[PDB]
Amino acid sequence: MISGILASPGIAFGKALLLKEDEIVIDRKKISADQVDQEVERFLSGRAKASAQLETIKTKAGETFGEEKEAIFEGHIMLLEDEELEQEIIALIKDKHMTADAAAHEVIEGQASALEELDDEYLKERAADVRDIGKRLLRNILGLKIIDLSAIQDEVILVAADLTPSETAQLNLKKVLGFITDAGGRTSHTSIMARSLELPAIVGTGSVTSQVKNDDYLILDAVNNQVYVNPTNEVIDKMRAVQEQVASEKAELAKLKDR
């Protein structure tokens, strides 16, 4: 009874992989000139590893999807390295006595909102992607661990409310059998990679992420635009025969000669 937008046709079986993240909380406490020096080291030093980690992902986007996607990530890194934005963030900490996480959010607050004022798909989408650059920085400033999605060792379905271009660029396509998320479906980066790879996919899940837990057994039919949650063995057996019968029918052509 879950009808999504159907991004690609096909049928797949696997466990539901739910991605859970800890919410990021900003501290609104004002520090004294005694701890301001520490903010500069964490901010200045944070950019040191952040630039290195993000820089590695840029190559993955170019070697995984080609230079077509590398150009989008290359521009985002320039913003982080802009000598102008760094000086402003530093001034807010010393001028307004704000923490590095709090001061950084102020700059990002206008960079993201400013891009939303433009009515271009690239500039507008850049607004969401730019917010991601600041969101990751916040997780680094507080020392929050990052989930490494490229370390998956079990073949299962990927389920998430939404994926950011950075997470998709470093995603492992060999261990994921499909993508099912709760994205509106308008220019969704996840759906775009799916169409290029022709793998089955869906995005209009609505609220499945709030109704499924990790390890749930799900069947993606990508045919009638419906997903089954907690299906009985009788249902699985029926789809296993008809679904596999389709794949076996195509193998008969290449088994003999040309028929």
Alpha carbon distance 206, 121 (integer Å): 23
Compute the distance between CA of residue 65 and CA of residue 63 in angstroms, rounded to an integer: 6
What is the side-by-side strand order in the sheet with 12-18? 201-202, 176-181, 156-160, 12-18, 217-220, 227-229
Q: Are 89 and 155 in contact (CB under 8 A)?
A: no
Which of 76, 97, 105, 189 is the catalytic position? 189
DSSP state of 36: H
21-146 belongs to which homologous superfamily?
A: PtsI, HPr-binding domain (1.10.274.10)
> 79 and 130 in contact (C-beta within 8 Å)?
yes
Residue 136: φ, ψ to 5° = -65, -40
The Cα–Cα gap between 163 and 212 comes to 17
Q: Which amino acid is at 84?
A: E
Do the strands 176-181 and 201-202 form a parallel or antiparallel pair, or are they unpaired? parallel
Write phi, then psi, for 82 (nearest 5 degrees).
-60, 125
- What's the N-to-C CA distance of the chain in angstroms? 39
Q: Is 189 a catalytic residue?
A: yes
Which residue numbers come right before each break in the chain (C to N over 2.5 Å)?
A: none
Q: How far is CA 240 from CA 62, 85, 170, 233, in A?
A: 37, 56, 32, 10
Where along the chain do its domains lie? 3-20+147-249, 21-146
Residue type, 160: A
Which class in CATH covers the domain with range 3-20+147-249?
Answer: alpha beta
In which region does residue 216 sit, left (phi positive, over 0), alpha (psi from -120 to 50) or beta (all else)? beta
Contact by Cβ (8 Å): 11, 101: no
